[PDB]
């Protein structure tokens, strides 16, 4: 059910009014924006909806696992069936572009986030990166839609789609090295920081590089997992990445909202953010046990930043204490 | 209307740098094509020499 | 007219109302331009050191041509092996066209047997590329020194 599964996923996804020229124009538009897709293609996507996306998921699962990751694979099957992976990437990115708009219905948000998850699954095939699949601008935009999927029982479906996309991206993250792309460090760690403030997380999380995809059902735990993945020198190159992430968490350590300065209002004293700061201290302590060297001067510089920027509140003083 | 030429100049700088990064990625993949061919030539030299 | 003149004196004032931000910016960019000239000089030294590597290779080539010519004078396959290693070093000689700035690329220094080897002076290998890396990390260049 691999080749036949890929074909069965491909009849709703290789239509008769498919514009490869639209895909090529979006490819040479540097993947910054997407013009509206065809009525036929999106009609054939919705005619079965997210069930077709799961059909594409079981179409790609033997190929992404590795028993069909060979010469007899996605690329040769696509060559013999006259299929492009670029058009699937363009469909995924148009669903991302749908998610970028604020006043968007919930099912379109789920379609976009699962589309980006299927894009990451297509990226997860080894050797598929060299076949002109990855583009940084659309990757940064689909990272940004994790922050932009909030509406600006909807939220459970939205967080389940976010959870599936974050599972696929956190699975893709150990294969990919952040050596040549330090711009995600700002981008994706910023969307981690923005996505910490979604749900209260009751239990203190012990964060390693072995937490499973479905083990952490909470977005701060998965963000901590991504940060602990990014502590490696292959992924966090130099001390600039560590200083940037330290300044990133510096906002949430200070018991304050997003932003900087005294114009930003102080956060209300809630035990959920007390639990979150205890998880931050536990994750930082896990980072300390591992580095036992580099972490000391960088956290001293962060403590210098802490002493530079204080808020005189007795509850805040107690928490910082 | 004084910062607008400066804004236009900075937009020219960022669009030019975006073109320069696209040039970097394109000729980097062009070098990566012979990096793949260099893998092939490496394997051919090892197999031929053995 | 004097009241109109006052605002003209004020015009003279606010053409450069503070001048310290522009002086500091042109000082920093002048530091960047001096870093560019200094890194160009260190880069010229690095081209010289790579030229010392090409002349170490070529001087070794000329010496082993002399020894294989002695072998041919005197055994045929030993001369052939000398010719093969000489041709292998001439194949490796491609780096003589040092494409870093091509200039010190083909230009030699005075002391060919002593100063024109790069593997015998690792300080010239290390300190110049370290200076070049420190400058290219600290460059931020712009003609805004000259422009401002």
């Amino acid at each position: 059910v691999a080749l036949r599964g890929l074909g069965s996923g491909l009849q709703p996804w290789c239509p008769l009014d498919l514009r490869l020229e639209w895909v090529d124009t979006v490819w040479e538009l540097d993947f910054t924006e997407t013009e509206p897709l065809d009525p036929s293609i999106e009609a054939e996507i919705i005619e079965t909806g997210l069930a077709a996306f799961t059909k594409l998921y079981e179409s790609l699962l033997p190929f992404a696992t590795g028993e069909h990751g060979s010469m007899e694979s996605i690329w040769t099957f696509f060559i013999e069936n006259n299929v492009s992976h670029s058009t699937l990437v363009a469909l995924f990115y148009h669903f991302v572009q749908i998610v970028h708009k604020k006043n968007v219905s919930v099912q379109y948000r789920e379609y976009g986030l699962h589309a980006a998850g299927l894009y990451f699954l297509l990226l997860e095939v080894p050797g598929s990166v060299a076949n002109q699949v990855f583009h940084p601008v659309m990757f940064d935009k689909c990272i940004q839609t994790l922050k932009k999927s909030w509406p600006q029982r909807d939220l459970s479906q939205i967080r389940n789609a976010i959870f599936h996309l974050l599972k696929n991206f956190l699975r893709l993250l150990p294969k990919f090295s952040l050596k040549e792309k330090p711009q995600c460090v700002q981008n994706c760690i910023e969307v981690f920081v923005s996505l910490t403030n979604f749900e209260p997380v009751l239990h203190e999380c012990h964060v390693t590089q072995a937490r499973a995809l479905n083990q952490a059902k909470y977005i701060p735990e998965l963000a901590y997992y991504g940060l602990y993945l990014l502590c490696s020198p292959i992924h966090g190159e130099g001390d600039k990445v560590i200083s940037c992430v330290f300044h990133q968490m510096l906002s949430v350590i200070l018991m304050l909202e997003v932003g900087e300065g005294s114009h930003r209002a102080p956060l209300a004293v809630t035990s959920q953010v007390i639990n979150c700061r205890n998880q931050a201290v536990q994750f930082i302590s896990a980072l300390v046990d591992e580095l036992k060297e580099s972490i000391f001067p960088v956290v001293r510089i962060l403590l210098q930043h802490i002493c530079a920027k204080v808020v005189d509140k007795s509850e805040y003083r107690t928490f910082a204490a | 209307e004084e910062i607008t030429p400066t804004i236009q100049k900075l937009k020219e700088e960022r669009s030019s740098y975006l073109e320069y990064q696209k040039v970097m990625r394109e000729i980097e993949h062009l070098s990566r094509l012979y990096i793949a061919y260099q893998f092939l030539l490496a394997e051919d030299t090892k197999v031929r020499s053995a | 007219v004097e009241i109109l003149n006052e605002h003209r004196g004020e015009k003279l004032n606010r053409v450069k109302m503070v001048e310290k931000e522009k002086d500091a910016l042109e000082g920093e960019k002048n530091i960047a331009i001096e870093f560019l000239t200094l890194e160009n000089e260190i880069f010229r030294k690095k081209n010289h050191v790579c030229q010392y590597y090409i002349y170490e290779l070529q001087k070794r080539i000329a010496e082993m041509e002399t020894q294989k010519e002695k072998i041919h004078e005197d055994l045929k396959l030993e001369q052939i092996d000398g010719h093969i290693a000489e041709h292998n070093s001439k194949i490796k000689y491609w780096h003589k066209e040092i494409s870093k700035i091509s200039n010190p690329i083909e230009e030699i220094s005075v002391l060919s047997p002593e100063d024109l080897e790069a593997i015998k002076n690792p300080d010239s290998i290390t300190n110049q590329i370290a200076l070049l890396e420190a400058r290219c990390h600290e460059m931020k260049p712009n003609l805004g020194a000259i422009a401002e």
Partner: protein
């Protein structure tokens, strides 16, 4: 005679590995075994670049783009900061 040639062949075979300028060590470094034959489709040529004699390509175009050392990356950073200031001023 042929044993001396075999010594040359053995020296070349052992010299394939364990060098950045050499050919097999960079195979070990990249581990590009997603293609066993590292050609895909058809091999074009050995003329756009060369393994034995490198720096013969459009790396001249890479260097010509690398004439400038100016970090116009923060303006090209997708925070769109100069146009963010433009939109804030508008």
């Amino acid at each position: 005679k042929i044993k001396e040639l075999d010594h040359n062949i053995s020296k070349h075979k052992r010299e394939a590995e364990d060098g950045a300028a050499k050919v097999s060590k960079m195979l070990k470094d990249y581990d590009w075994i997603n293609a066993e034959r590292h050609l895909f489709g058809q091999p074009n040529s050995a003329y756009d670049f060369k393994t034995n004699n490198p720096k013969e390509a459009g790396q001249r175009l890479q260097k010509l783009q690398e004439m400038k050392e100016k970090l116009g990356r923060n303006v090209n950073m997708r925070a769109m900061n100069v146009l963010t200031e433009a939109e804030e001023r508008y």
